[PDB]
Structure formats: structure tokens, C-alpha cells
Design a protein around this ligand. Structure first.
Ligand SMILES: OC[C@H]1O[C@@H](O[C@H]2[C@H](O)[C@@H](O)[C@@H](O)O[C@@H]2CO)[C@H](O)[C@@H](O)[C@H]1O
Ligand SMILES: Nc1ccn([C@@H]2O[C@H](COP(=O)(O)O)[C@@H](O)[C@H]2O)c(=O)n1
Ligand SMILES: [Mg+2]
Ligand SMILES: [Mg+2]
Ligand SMILES: [Mg+2]
Length: 493
């Protein structure tokens, strides 16, 4: 007439999911009549004793294609008021998203993918095996994450088993996979060779995010390859045979294997610096070969998040922005962030690494050095995520210094517009991305041996970083190379 009390419920809902929904929000509320009626949808879901309870109880059907189902509730209260509520169930394929990385860069990008996906795909389940970010149980619950411990930095057996159980248990399954690029082969292969025999599972996408500079060193060496295209095609058959189980030798985990995902699956390569495949003429073949799966890693994920998403993100990466802003604020002096490094597979080297980085910081803040920033600065430190005892040694050398928790990827400071006035430090993937104008100087690693300059410049990382226009050859600095500031006066070598 219409004093009929209307309500509308909309839900999404995977195959075989149980649903129990209250039609009304008036309390009690007590009904004389009602009726439940399936009103759209092809499979019949209302089983007669369903209809007789006031809350709606149904099991989503097994489907081949997503489909909407409709149910109309009508009631007359004892009062005797009329109610009508229209219910829509969007039934969608069960889906899985798997993300694996032991490093920093890929894990950061995967995090941003998860947060976006929690909005776009609420019913997706998410499995992570991460080394350097650990969400709380609350955060996991909020993002539908189950977590798994990396073994030898790679996909663990228990992650694979859990994926197998989903394949066995879900009637159709969409899977997305995401990995560290350099380490794809050991992260994804054990998963893909299980899933390969499951006809109900569709691998809809594989995302590859660069470890960082590591893949560029590899590509720099791989420039030498004769018959690149031949090697890559042999790469496809090899990878194909390994996943099919036809070939048992799972040993060629490197370059010619890692750039074939797109030949076997829908896949996207998110390059830290896509332009490297163009800047190096000899890699044009590889650029051709990756074709329209070649993407540039994006840094607008944070900006594109809504404000709740931005908070959840900062909270998961443990960045307290307001606290850093306070610290910036605070002193008259402009702010300087020194970015540190770590040694992989060289624990015997890390005290030497600490002592050298202390010397690099000293060069920046000591007037008796040509690398002097030019003014007094408040001193800030970032911490290599894997720096461990290197970070504590550097930290206790400076009373004085403010940490930037080392676990925070530096690019989140870029994305949050929390870059200081000056940044300098050790050669790192972070310099592949940070705007040139912020960089005061970059310093490359030296061993206790060389110290010779000509062949020091030969180092792949140096040649990458030159080619990318990050640094100019005539200005490359090596630790050793730099004046010794340890006594308080900077003395030339
Ligand atoms: O950029 C990350 C590099 O990690 C190296 O692995 C380290 C690992 O990160 C650390 O947590 C511990 O397990 O020591 C490992 C030994 O090197 C990889 O070896 C390297 O390839 C990079 O991915
Ligand atoms: N001082 C540093 C060094 C590295 N990192 C993080 O680790 C990633 C890989 O850096 P490296 O090339 O130094 O290993 C960087 O992109 C950045 O996310 C950092 O946040 N702070
Ligand atoms: Mg990690
Ligand atoms: Mg070239
Ligand atoms: Mg200040």
C-alpha cells in the first residue's frame, strides 16, 4: 500500500558454501505466516523443510559457471505487519591465491596485491609463505590468509599439501600463483606438478615479482648467451616436462627456466626495471620472448588504496608514519637517511660490512670528506631487512641516530611521501626505484682484498646500475676508494 517493510540482502558465496541468513532486522519480531521462495537460479536449492524456518538455510550448488540465485521472503508479524525481503546470492567458483617469497621486494608487492584482492575477491582464500613480513592472526583473519613456514627459502611441503587438499575438495577451483622471479622455479614447480593432474583446477595467472637487483645481475651475464631464442625454447620444453613429471632432473632452476612461465600459463612478469630489456640491445630477444607478459612493477598501489586499506597496509609492514613525521619535525636540520646493506652467504663478512658502512656514514656527515653532504643533518638509518647484527653494530655507533625499523621496505617511505631531504647509502635495489633528485651518493661494496678499480667496475651490479642511468661510471664509488674517517679526520687512501 505500501507500509510493507522492505529489506535487501546480497551475498557472494562459493560452490557448496552453506548459508544461513536472517531476513529481517526488527528483533524479535514474531511471524504468523511466512514464505520463502526461490525466485531465480537454475538449480533448485529450497528443500521443503528449508522453507519452514524463518531464517534462510541453503547450500550453494556445484556449478560450471558463476550464477546468481534469488530468494524472496514474505512475512506477516503477529502485529500483523507485512515484511518482504529480497535475497541475492552470487555463487562464484572457489578460488585460491598463493604468494611465496623469502626476500623483500616481491613480498611487498604481494602484500599490496592481497589487500586489493580482499576488496575485489572477498571469497578468495590466501596462502602465503613469507620470510620478512609476518601479519598478526588478526590481520591474517582480516585478509583470509593462512601462513606457511618457508623451508630453505622456498615453498614448503605443507603448503603444497594444503593446495592439494583444496584441489581434491573443491569441485572447481581457480588458482592464482605469485612468486619471487629468480626463485620461481623452486617455489612454483612443486605446486604445478601436483595441480597438473587436477582437471577441476584452473591456474588463472602467475605473477612474477623480481627479488630485486639479483635478476638484473643474472640478465647482465645472460647477455653473453649464444642463440638466446634457442635456449629459451629449450627452457619451455624442460619446464613443461618437469611439471608433467616426464623429466625428473629438476636442476635447471635458472635464467632459461624462469622466463618461460608465460609460454605455459597466463602469466605476468613485473620487472623492477622493465626498461632494462630495451636499454640492453642484446636482451631485445628476451623482451620479444616475454612479449605482452612483460610489465613494469607499479608503485601506485598504496595511493590507490582506500584509507582503511592504507592503515591496514602500514600496520602490516610496521610503519608508524606519524612517529617518523614527529622525528623529522623536531629539529631545524634537514633530514638524512643512510640506507644500509647486508651480506648474503657471507656471515664471516658482516663485521667488516658494519665497519665499512660506519665509514660511509662518516664520509657523509664529516666536513673533512669530499662526500660531505654540505650541511648538518639529522641522521636517520634504514636497515637492510636482512642486516641482523650489521644493523645493531651500525646503530650503537650513533647515539644520536634514529632507526627507521629495518623491516620496513624503503619504498613504502616513497609511497607514503615520507622521503627525507637527503638519501645516500649502499648500492641496492631500492635505488632502482627512488627518484634521482633525492639521492646524494651511492657506494658499492669492496672486499678486504682487491682494492683495484678497473675490474671492480666490471661487477655486474655496477654495470646494471650504470646502464639504468642510476649512476655514472666516472663517479661510481667503492667502499675502498673512500677516505678513512675512523679517527674523526677523513684521511685519503
Ligand atoms: O635478495 C634476497 C637474497 O636472499 C638470499 O638468501 C638468503 C636469505 O635471504 C636469508 O634469509 C638467509 O636464508 O640466507 C640466505 C643465504 O644466501 C638468496 O640466496 C639470494 O638469491 C637472494 O634471493
Ligand atoms: N637499506 C635497505 C635495503 C633494502 N631494502 C629493501 O630490500 C629490497 C632489496 O634491496 P637490496 O637490493 O639491498 O637487497 C629493496 O627494494 C628494499 O625493499 C630496504 O628497505 N632498505
Ligand atoms: Mg619475505
Ligand atoms: Mg645488450
Ligand atoms: Mg628535522
Amino acid at each position: 500500500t505500501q507500509s510493507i517493510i522492505k529489506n535487501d540482502i546480497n551475498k557472494t558465496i562459493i560452490d557448496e558454501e552453506y548459508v544461513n541468513l536472517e531476513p529481517i532486522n526488527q528483533s524479535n519480531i514474531s511471524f504468523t505466516k511466512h514464505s520463502w521462495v526461490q525466485t531465480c537460479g537454475t538449480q533448485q536449492l529450497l528443500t521443503e523443510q528449508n522453507k519452514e524456518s524463518i531464517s534462510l538455510s541453503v547450500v550453494a550448488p556445484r556449478l560450471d559457471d558463476d550464477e546468481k540465485y534469488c530468494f524472496d521472503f514474505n512475512g506477516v508479524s503477529n502485529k500483523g505487519e507485512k515484511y518482504i525481503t529480497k535475497v541475492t546470492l552470487n555463487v562464484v567458483a572457489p578460488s585460491l591465491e598463493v604468494y611465496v617469497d623469502h626476500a623483500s621486494l616481491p613480498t611487498l608487492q604481494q602484500l599490496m596485491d592481497i589487500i586489493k584482492s580482499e576488496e575485489e575477491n572477498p571469497t578468495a582464500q590466501r596462502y602465503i609463505a613469507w620470510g620478512r613480513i609476518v601479519p598478526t592472526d588478526e590481520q591474517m583473519k582480516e585478509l583470509n590468509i593462512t601462513s606457511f613456514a618457508l623451508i630453505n627459502n622456498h615453498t614448503p611441503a605443507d603448503l603444497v599439501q594444503e593446495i592439494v587438499k583444496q584441489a581434491q575438495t573443491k569441485h572447481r577451483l581457480n588458482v592464482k600463483l605469485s612468486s619471487n622471479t629468480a626463485h620461481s622455479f623452486d617455489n612454483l614447480v612443486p605446486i604445478l606438478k601436483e595441480l597438473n593432474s587436477f582437471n577441476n583446477v584452473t591456474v588463472t595467472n602467475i605473477d612474477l615479482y623480481d627479488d630485486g637487483s639479483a635478476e638484473y645481475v643474472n640478465l647482465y651475464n645472460w647477455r653473453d648467451t649464444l642463440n638466446k631464442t634457442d635456449n629459451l625454447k629449450i627452457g619451455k620444453d624442460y619446464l613443461e616436462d618437469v611439471i608433467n613429471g616426464i623429466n625428473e632432473d629438476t636442476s635447471n632452476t635458472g635464467t632459461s627456466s624462469v622466463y618461460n612461465w608465460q609460454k605455459l600459463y597466463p602469466a605476468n612478469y613485473h620487472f623492477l626495471r622493465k626498461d632494462y630489456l630495451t636499454l640492453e640491445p642484446s636482451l631485445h630477444e628476451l623482451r620479444d620472448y616475454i612479449g605482452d607478459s612483460l610489465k613494469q612493477m607499479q608503485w601506485d598501489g598504496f595511493k590507490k588504496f582506500n584509507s582503511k586499506q592504507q592503515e591496514l597496509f602500514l600496520s602490516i609492514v610496521n610503519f608508524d608514519k606519524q612517529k617518523l613525521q614527529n622525528e623529522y619535525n623536531s629539529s631545524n636540520l634537514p633530514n638524512f637517511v643512510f640506507t644500509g646493506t647486508t651480506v648474503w652467504a657471507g656471515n664471516h663478512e658482516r663485521e667488516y660490512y658494519a665497519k665499512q658502512q660506519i665509514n660511509v656514514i662518516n664520509n657523509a656527515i664529516n666536513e673533512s670528506s669530499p662526500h660531505y653532504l654540505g650541511n648538518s643533518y639529522d641522521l636517520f638509518f634504514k636497515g637492510h631487512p636482512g642486516g641482523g647484527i650489521i644493523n645493531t653494530l651500525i646503530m650503537q655507533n650513533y647515539p644520536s641516530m634514529v632507526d627507521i625499523p629495518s623491516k620496513i621496505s624503503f619504498e613504502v617511505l616513497m609511497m607514503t611521501d615520507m622521503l627525507p631531504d637527503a638519501v645516500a647509502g649502499i648500492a641496492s635495489s631500492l635505488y632502482f626505484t627512488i627518484p634521482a633528485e633525492k639521492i646524494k651518493f651511492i657506494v658499492f661494496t669492496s672486499t678486504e682484498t682487491i682494492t683495484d678499480r678497473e675490474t671492480a667496475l666490471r661487477s655486474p651490479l655496477v654495470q646494471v646500475m650504470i646502464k639504468l642511468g642510476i649512476v655514472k661510471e666516472e663517479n661510481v664509488l667503492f667502499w675502498a676508494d673512500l677516505p678513512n674517517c675512523e679517527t674523526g679526520v677523513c684521511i685519503a687512501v
